[PDB]
Amino acid sequence: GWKYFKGNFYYFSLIPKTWYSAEQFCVSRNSHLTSVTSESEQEFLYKTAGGLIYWIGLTKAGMEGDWSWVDDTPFNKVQSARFWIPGEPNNAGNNEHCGNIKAPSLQAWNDAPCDKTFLFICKRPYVP
Ligand SMILES: OC[C@H]1O[C@H](O)[C@@H](O)[C@@H](O)[C@@H]1O
Ligand SMILES: [Ca+2]
Hints:
128 residues; sugar binding protein; C-type lectin; carbohydrate-binding; globular; monomer; eight-stranded mixed sheet; alpha+beta; 20% helix; monomeric
């Protein structure tokens, strides 16, 4: 059921999980919750998501609470600015330390509580 895009396979889950249980599921399939590092990847993801909300690999790191990617892709604050839903990350209720794809737009990301359950997207490198 994995979908292929530019050197990576992607798994769009059928069952919802908390952010961490999702990441664990990805790790069990030799993958990680997806990073997003280009306009074309954002576009591939939100179109495939079809208007439903999916956990991606966005999570906070460091004392400053900077955003990071669980797959260890360095997070680029400048290049990622265009990918958030206007108003996000808003840190609602001071408890939104993980990120999902929510809106079917390039401006797609929302921060939400890590313990909420959503469908999720795994990303696995293809290695010829
Ligand atoms: O109003 C926007 C707000 O809606 C809900 O409260 C949650 O999804 C938050 O993550 C989001 O910031
Ligand atoms: Ca939010």
